[PDB]
């Protein structure tokens with residue numbers, strides 16, 4: 001399947017829509033589709049690529065940085081996240097973490 005992924009940058013007031021394959025990470029699809037997003041490690045072990053779910057689900061089983069509570073709050077590491085439904089997510093949420 002292929003899911004619609006809506007990227008929202010609150011500080012910039014932008015809204016971009018991308019199509020992501022069930023077996024591709026969100027960040028990868030975003031770049032291919034022309035949207036550069038923040039990143040560093042690309043391996044699920046930092047917070048640079050952090051985003052926050054507005055709606056929808058992801059499988060980020062490969063991440064390791066976020067604790068359970070943060071996940072509960074809706075945070076996602078875009079670099080290692082696969083969409084598991086259509087999703088609406090806020091990007092550039094790195095600073096929200098502590």
Ligand code: FES
Nearest residue numbers: 040042045046079
């Ligand atoms: S860039 Fe480091 S966890 Fe995604």
